[model samples]
Target: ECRYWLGGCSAGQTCCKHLVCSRRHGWCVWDGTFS
Candidate 1:
């Protein structure tokens, strides 16, 4: 099964692992960790 959250930014702007905003000042971090 798969669970997902939808709101705010799109998947391209969201982290696949943590599912949070993946942008750090308008760039993709791609570190797979949340702060």
Candidate 2:
């Protein structure tokens, strides 16, 4: 799946980065976005 191993936004994030993003999706996650 190109959308998997390659790139794109998954669940408001970069797939696994989004999963990692899911984990950090609190205020901290917002800060990551800002910073």
Candidate 3:
């Protein structure tokens, strides 16, 4: 039920360096989905 492609920025978080709070909400870090 996780349609990331249709989620539209569901992985809406920063990338690389000091990635905080990005992993807890399906957010992407370092340009990658937090799956």
Judging by lDDT against the true structure, name the best candidate.
1
**Candidate 2, 1-35: lDDT as tens digits:** 21232333345554433222233333213223433
TM-score of 1: 0.19
Error of 2 at 11 (Å): 6.2
Q: Rank the candidates by TM-score, best first.
A: 1, 3, 2
Relative to the true structure, how large is the alpha-carbon lDDT of every model? 0.41, 0.33, 0.36
Model 1 lDDT, full chain set: 0.41
Lowest summed-lDDT stretch of 10 residues in model 2?
22-31
Q: lDDT by residue for model 3 over 1-35, one digit each (tens)?
A: 32232232334433333233344455433334344
What C-alpha lDDT does candidate 3 achieve relative to the native structure? 0.36
List RMSD in Å for every model shown: 7.6, 8.3, 9.8
TM-score of 3: 0.18
Rate residue 33 of model 3 by lDDT.
35
Clashes of each: 0, 0, 1
**TM, every model:** 0.19, 0.15, 0.18
**lDDT ranking from best to worst?**
1, 3, 2
Comparison by TM-score, 1 against 2, better one: 1
